[PDB]
CSV table of C-alpha atoms in Angstrom, one decimal:
chain,number,residue,atom,x,y,z
A,7,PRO,CA,277.7,224.9,364.1
A,8,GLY,CA,276.0,221.5,361.6
A,9,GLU,CA,274.3,218.6,362.3
A,10,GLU,CA,276.9,216.8,360.8
A,11,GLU,CA,280.0,218.0,362.3
A,12,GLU,CA,277.8,217.9,365.9
A,13,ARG,CA,277.5,215.0,365.2
A,14,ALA,CA,280.6,213.8,364.3
A,15,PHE,CA,282.3,215.0,367.6
A,16,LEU,CA,279.9,212.4,370.3
A,17,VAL,CA,281.1,210.1,368.2
A,18,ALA,CA,284.5,211.0,367.9
A,19,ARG,CA,284.0,211.2,371.8
A,20,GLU,CA,282.5,207.9,372.3
A,21,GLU,CA,285.5,205.9,370.1
A,22,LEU,CA,288.6,207.6,371.6
A,23,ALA,CA,287.4,207.2,375.0
A,24,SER,CA,286.9,203.3,374.4
A,25,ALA,CA,290.2,202.9,372.7
A,26,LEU,CA,290.9,204.1,375.9
A,27,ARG,CA,289.4,201.7,378.2
A,28,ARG,CA,291.1,199.4,375.7
A,29,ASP,CA,294.1,199.8,375.4
A,30,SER,CA,294.7,203.1,377.7
A,31,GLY,CA,298.9,202.9,376.5
A,32,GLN,CA,298.2,203.9,373.3
A,33,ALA,CA,298.8,207.0,370.3
A,34,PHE,CA,296.5,208.5,368.7
A,35,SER,CA,296.6,210.3,365.7
A,36,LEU,CA,295.7,214.5,364.8
A,37,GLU,CA,293.8,212.3,362.1
A,38,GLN,CA,292.4,210.0,365.2
A,39,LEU,CA,291.7,213.7,366.8
A,40,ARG,CA,290.0,215.8,363.7
A,41,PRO,CA,286.9,215.3,365.0
A,42,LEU,CA,287.0,216.6,367.7
A,43,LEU,CA,290.0,219.7,367.4
A,44,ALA,CA,288.9,220.9,364.0
A,45,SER,CA,285.2,221.6,364.4
A,46,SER,CA,283.6,225.3,364.6
A,47,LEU,CA,282.4,223.3,367.5
A,48,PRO,CA,282.0,226.0,370.6
A,49,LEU,CA,284.4,225.0,373.6
A,50,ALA,CA,282.1,225.1,375.9
A,51,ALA,CA,280.6,222.8,373.9
A,52,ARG,CA,282.9,220.1,372.8
A,53,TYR,CA,284.7,219.7,376.7
A,54,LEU,CA,282.2,218.2,378.6
A,55,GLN,CA,284.1,217.8,381.6
A,56,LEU,CA,287.6,220.1,381.3
A,57,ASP,CA,286.6,224.1,381.7
A,58,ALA,CA,288.6,224.6,379.2
A,59,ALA,CA,289.0,228.4,378.8
A,60,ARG,CA,289.2,228.3,382.5
A,61,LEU,CA,292.2,226.5,382.9
A,62,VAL,CA,294.0,228.4,380.2
A,63,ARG,CA,292.2,232.3,381.3
A,64,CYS,CA,293.6,231.6,384.9
A,65,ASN,CA,296.8,231.2,383.8
A,66,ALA,CA,296.9,233.2,381.3
A,67,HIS,CA,300.6,234.8,383.0
A,68,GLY,CA,303.0,236.9,381.3
A,69,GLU,CA,303.7,235.3,376.8
A,70,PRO,CA,301.4,232.3,375.3
A,71,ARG,CA,304.5,231.4,374.5
A,72,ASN,CA,305.0,230.0,378.2
A,73,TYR,CA,302.1,229.7,379.4
A,74,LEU,CA,301.3,227.8,377.3
A,75,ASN,CA,304.2,225.5,377.4
A,76,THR,CA,303.7,225.6,381.3
A,77,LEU,CA,299.8,224.6,381.1
A,78,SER,CA,300.8,221.7,378.3
A,79,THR,CA,303.8,220.4,381.2
A,80,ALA,CA,301.2,220.3,383.1
A,81,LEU,CA,298.3,218.4,381.1
A,82,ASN,CA,301.1,215.8,380.1
A,83,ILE,CA,301.6,215.6,383.8
A,84,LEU,CA,297.7,214.7,384.1
A,85,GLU,CA,297.0,212.4,380.5
A,86,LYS,CA,299.8,210.0,382.7
A,87,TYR,CA,297.0,210.2,385.8
A,88,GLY,CA,294.2,208.6,383.8
A,89,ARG,CA,296.3,206.9,381.9
A,90,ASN,CA,297.8,204.6,384.8
A,91,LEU,CA,294.7,204.2,385.9
A,92,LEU,CA,293.2,202.3,382.8
A,93,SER,CA,296.1,200.5,382.9
A,94,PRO,CA,295.6,196.5,383.0
A,95,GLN,CA,297.9,197.1,385.1
A,96,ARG,CA,297.7,200.2,387.4
A,97,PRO,CA,300.9,201.8,389.0
A,98,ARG,CA,300.9,201.1,392.7
A,99,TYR,CA,300.7,203.9,394.5
A,100,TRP,CA,298.0,204.6,391.7
A,101,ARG,CA,295.3,205.4,394.6
A,102,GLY,CA,296.6,208.6,396.5
A,103,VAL,CA,298.6,211.6,394.3
A,104,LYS,CA,300.8,213.1,396.8
A,105,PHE,CA,301.7,217.3,396.3
A,106,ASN,CA,305.6,217.1,398.6
A,107,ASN,CA,307.1,215.5,395.1
A,108,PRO,CA,309.3,217.9,393.1
A,109,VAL,CA,307.5,216.6,389.6
A,110,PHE,CA,304.6,217.3,391.1
A,111,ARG,CA,305.8,220.5,391.5
A,112,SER,CA,307.0,221.8,389.0
A,113,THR,CA,304.5,220.4,386.8
A,114,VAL,CA,300.7,219.7,387.9
A,115,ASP,CA,300.5,222.8,390.9
A,116,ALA,CA,302.9,224.5,388.2
A,117,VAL,CA,299.4,225.5,387.0
A,118,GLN,CA,296.2,226.7,388.7
A,119,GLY,CA,293.3,224.4,388.5
A,120,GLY,CA,295.5,221.3,388.5
A,121,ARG,CA,294.9,219.5,392.3
A,122,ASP,CA,291.4,220.6,390.4
A,123,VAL,CA,291.6,217.7,387.2
A,124,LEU,CA,293.0,215.1,389.4
A,125,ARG,CA,289.8,215.1,391.7
A,126,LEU,CA,288.1,214.6,388.5
A,127,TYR,CA,289.7,212.1,387.8
A,128,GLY,CA,288.1,210.5,391.3
A,129,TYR,CA,291.0,211.3,393.4
A,130,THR,CA,288.4,213.2,395.4
A,131,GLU,CA,289.2,213.1,399.3
A,132,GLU,CA,291.9,215.8,401.3
A,133,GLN,CA,295.0,214.3,403.0
A,134,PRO,CA,297.6,215.7,404.9
A,135,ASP,CA,299.9,216.5,401.7
A,136,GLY,CA,297.8,215.7,399.2
A,137,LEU,CA,294.3,213.5,398.3
A,138,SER,CA,293.5,209.5,397.7
A,139,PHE,CA,290.2,207.8,395.9
A,140,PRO,CA,287.5,207.1,399.1
A,141,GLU,CA,288.4,204.5,400.9
A,142,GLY,CA,284.5,203.1,400.7
A,143,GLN,CA,286.6,202.8,396.3
A,144,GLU,CA,287.1,200.4,395.4
A,145,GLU,CA,287.6,200.2,391.0
A,146,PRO,CA,288.4,204.3,389.2
A,147,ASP,CA,284.8,204.4,387.3
A,148,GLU,CA,287.3,204.0,383.8
A,149,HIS,CA,284.2,205.5,381.7
A,150,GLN,CA,284.9,209.0,384.5
A,151,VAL,CA,288.8,208.3,383.9
A,152,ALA,CA,288.6,207.5,380.1
A,153,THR,CA,286.5,210.1,379.9
A,154,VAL,CA,288.3,212.7,381.3
A,155,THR,CA,291.8,211.9,380.2
A,156,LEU,CA,291.5,212.2,376.9
A,157,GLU,CA,289.8,216.3,376.8
A,158,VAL,CA,292.8,216.4,378.5
A,159,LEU,CA,294.0,214.7,375.9
A,160,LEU,CA,292.6,216.9,373.5
A,161,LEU,CA,293.4,219.8,375.4
A,162,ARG,CA,297.2,219.6,376.1
A,163,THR,CA,297.3,218.4,371.8
A,164,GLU,CA,294.7,222.1,370.8
A,165,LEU,CA,297.7,223.7,373.1
A,166,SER,CA,300.6,222.7,371.4
A,167,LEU,CA,298.7,223.0,367.9
A,168,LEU,CA,298.6,227.1,369.0
A,169,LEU,CA,302.7,226.8,370.1
A,170,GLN,CA,304.2,225.3,366.8
A,171,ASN,CA,301.3,227.4,364.5
A,172,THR,CA,299.3,225.2,362.8
A,173,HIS,CA,296.2,225.4,364.5
A,174,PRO,CA,293.9,224.7,362.9
A,175,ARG,CA,292.2,228.4,364.4
A,176,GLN,CA,295.7,230.0,365.2
A,177,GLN,CA,295.0,233.3,364.3
A,178,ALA,CA,291.7,234.2,365.9
A,179,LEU,CA,292.8,231.7,369.1
A,180,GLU,CA,296.1,234.1,369.2
A,181,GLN,CA,293.6,237.2,368.7
A,182,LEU,CA,292.4,236.1,372.0
A,183,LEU,CA,295.3,236.2,374.3
């Protein structure tokens, strides 16, 4: 894995995290994602906040066409939590997540590790039925939220590519499953 690929990787990570801070609702192209998506960098080197290998491995129950979809659905909702925390107007209720919610039950809690991703955003205080930002913390940490959101987006993107039979490393990745 070369010097140029490693440098491109980090430049992309910083550029896209900055873009998410600047305008958290914008869509990103595959071209923008390329330096993070078609690189020869190992998994442990590409995901620095999420343990992406564990998120997949722990949920690798039954048929990949199904569990990759289940993970994608959870990641979509987790990516909206991060984009909303970065938005010039955060939704009301942004400070807390309630587990007793029908969408939450069928999405984020349909995968092992879903709640821990919310913790990485800053929802670190345990509550009777959910998680919240601690009272002493006034605002989200934009750098932390943006890097987590980008990794959630990237992993959703890779899983979507595998489901579309179009991942740059589709064959090697399918053998692993």
